[PDB]
């Protein structure tokens, strides 16, 4: 692994390095200037005036091996140099630490060999035996030089892939003071301290303090940075204080609390009665037994014989008739209840004391007198009582008659009739039904 | 001159 | 554009730089020491031992042009030097890269000219023809030196404003290892890795991981960092499960649902009745027709003649008197309904069989009945319904007597009078009104 | 404060430094190379090729003073060197700024003295009077060298504790361009700018933008990064819109609103009546006065003599008996109410007009009438209201009979007997009670 470079130069060299006595380098302004350029701590390929690495690869011909190396410079550390102590020309003193050569390449090296179609490691080697002796090693994983050297890079003759790790200075310092710092990859430290601004990868610039995980302590009531819940969705796992909503419960609205669902403490048969005073209370409303019920609140008649069909009621097993009568004071008499030939033929005719009365196809003498008189009816139809008077004020008045009388179903039904000879009655009836059947069942 | 064959500061760098 | 500095020096220079064969710089310890101080990649103004830039501006006289430069050192790069290859004393080899001179100013340069009252660019220039030849260019945008030079800065002769971009080293490295790194401006990196601590601009030190935008996904239930909602303000856009609040709806509390607003499924006329058992049901309460109503629940009398105004009732078109009586068995009999001269003179007199009865300015022959023998009241005022007896046990008892009798309005009103000569009468009445008018309408 | 090192070397030195003309250093490659290694701005201990500080302490022997220094190199700045201006051999020109020496130690220095059992400062001093003249100061706060020196570190002879500030290069630059940057301590910048990635101390990598404090403004509805409240816990400080819950208020569910608690607008005595078609309304249900109430709804009889204890009513002060009857037309007659010898012997016997009837141990002739006649009943027990008739249709039929009759308590109780000679009798009764006491109070 050799390519003895015809024109490379290395500096500096003495009897105290590996050269014979006659073969010490001659001094040049260019050598001192290029040596002064050293900056790193290790061995590295030098950068140009722009800050671009030199000794770069070009014209990688891949599997046909060959590659071009551009000119430039690199620094190579070597240990075991001897120096002259002070005024004594005798090379006498060993250096304790490794110290740099500059390697200057004035020409592009042309079509340097590699192994075919595989990975190769490239090394630049200085031979400390001459002013100038330089060679290159290459090969498929082939060994680095024993001699002072730098790993100029790696080229793969199959893929054409290249990397070079040693291509700018590793630098170790204590404190760095700078205007600006710009790293290609990582910036790292045990404390990154962004005074004035921190910019994230989204390009947002922050000044105020950032947020840690588990900051939920703050968003709650009475913590710093509380949130307003107005407008948010969901249901809370605890039920919430209900806002005013009485009106929503009404008869046909979205909420409908029907009364037959509600509680009451009240005893059986109690009813909510209003007390006035806005308030309900559990009272009891008790209807009577002995229930009587109306059918037809009977028509008026006046200045005329009573238009008597005062009941044409629905069937009730017992009817109670009640009358009010205004008068012909000049000619009172009977409120006739001779009736006529009703649907069934039951009537009885008995009076106040008279014990007997006469009968025909339409009745002879059943009367209800507009005069307090020995005149009554008692039968299956027609149980009567009591007799009124044709006056209040001795001549004329409205405030006159009443009677209460009743009949059973003998016929399933009946209307009731009337007459008065004098014509000039006026009359109102009431009629009410009650219900016990004609046998063993009401 | 060459390195080593001068005490420092008592010669100019290069050549005639 | 020239100011040939009388005392400035430049190093290094030899036959291979631009100097004549004899005019090579004589070597000095100070030159080597100052040259070794080179550190950057470019051309820059050198720092003092403190880390402050040298060659500083002072005493800017503004519109009167002149300005002072303080002593110091700068590094100026030049290409195209020649060197001796190894032992061969002939200058024979060209350097591939630009390499530094040191420029040393031992004195302040005093009152250097500028153009009047405008911007000016300042350049320090080496003439590579002499050991020492140095000059300065200045002017209103006047052309930079063609000779090796550095842009020492810019000065405005109107405003006195100054900047200088080349005042410390640009430095390009591969890996920087440091203790502390402190930039006056930007620390940019394509990854910033704050191990141990990150401090923001507010001076808050974070160790735990920071929060991204769109972290709100976490604050919900069963997420990490869930928040308690207790005490937060606002209304949720969804309505919420209501807490226990039955009692709030009460008669005069905040919520108020009136019973007339509530639903029922019940049929017409149904009423909520308590079944006991805490529960309501929609049954029906049915009052009778043939309604009768009280006025004044009639007074007691005992050991005395009856306090006979047993009612002085409000107008009802019909009244129903009912009596309860305890009787003087030693002298029973007459229950003289004396009823003397009531407001209108309607009466009738008839007995239970006696057909006719006597009358006077006050009642001679109307009685209710202590001894169940024959008597009656029959008239527009006074319809009777049979008699009563003065004994339970054959001698004496309390458990004796009742009757039921009625009167119409003939007078619009009435109060009923009664007497007994025996004295030892005792009594309660009831009275109830009913309402059919004395004409064609109730 | 001295240890004149027998083998240390210093470079460079000329007449332009503190040496005599006999005593100028000889030039060496090793000196030039080691000098070019200088990089920092100040005076510092030089790093090895790894980037580790040289001239390290070893074998600190505590209160027995002695300490070992390992070989290496350090740089020491000195001011006030003189140089040759150009070609002139006369050392004549002052340097404006301080410039470095190299100090090379080829050997370990062994068991160097300190003061006993206290803190000590160690200083390495160049004596600018010879080619190689170097000495070390040490002592308990003993004065640093006057001569060009570096504070090599501090050792405490009591504790064995050591620190050293000057152990690598302080470096000040304008712009740093690097691949990777790594501080052992702080990174500081007036803007920290993480393109691509920021990593916190927890080792989480952020690309998206970070969160500021007071971000709570965003979490609310309509904001970016809204939170859904479903599942969260607590009570909101404002009451919430109540979700549908009508059914929860029911009789024996969790919420319980009893009807007696509720409002009504209704007047006194008003009751919620269902109108039908859902809505309740505040009508009034009015029971009548003149209240009558049942005890035992009477048994049927047919084809048989009356099973006559037809009711056994409780102690109401007045009973109202009502009858319904059917019988054989071959033998109608009396509904016998002769009864038996009752608990108390109250009777009266009066018929319609008959005025009188016979009395015995059990009754001779008290009757109720199948076929309308003079037959009637009046007494303390037993008041009557007339007679029915023996037919409906002329031939045998059910629809024959009713009557109403009443009695007081004479005995506190009673049950009523009956007989009918035809046998082929049939019946139903009603009974109702009414209360007024046999004295001055109901
Ligand atoms: Mg030699
Ligand atoms: Mg080629
Ligand atoms: Mg050489
Ligand atoms: Mg010069
Ligand atoms: Mg010459
Ligand atoms: Mg001045
Ligand atoms: Mg000399
Ligand atoms: Mg030791
Ligand atoms: Mg020396
Ligand atoms: Zn949050
Ligand atoms: Zn509610």
Numbering used by the authors:
A (entry chain BG), C (entry chain BI), D (entry chain BH): 2 to 443
B (entry chain BE): 2 to 17
Original paper wording:
Here, we present the near-atomic resolution structure of Haloferax tailed virus 1 (HFTV1), an archaeal virus thriving in extreme salinity. Through single-particle analysis, we obtained near-atomic resolution maps of DNA-filled and empty virions, enabling us to assemble full atomic models of the virus pre- and post-DNA release, including all structural protein components. The full atomic structure revealed that the virus has a length of 1350 Å and an icosahedral head with a diameter of ~600 Å. The tail has a length of 560 Å and terminates into a baseplate with three radiating TFs of ~190 Å in length.
The BPH also anchors three TFs. The TFs are formed as a homotrimer of gp42 [TF protein (TFP)]. Three TFPs come together to form a base, followed by a β-helix, a stalk, and a head. The TFs are connected to the N terminus of each BPH subunit and radiate away at a ~45°. This interaction is stabilized by extensive hydrogen bonds and Mg2+ ion coordination. A DynaMight analysis revealed that the TFs are highly flexible with respect to the BPH, likely aiding their ability to dock to the S-layer at the cell surface.
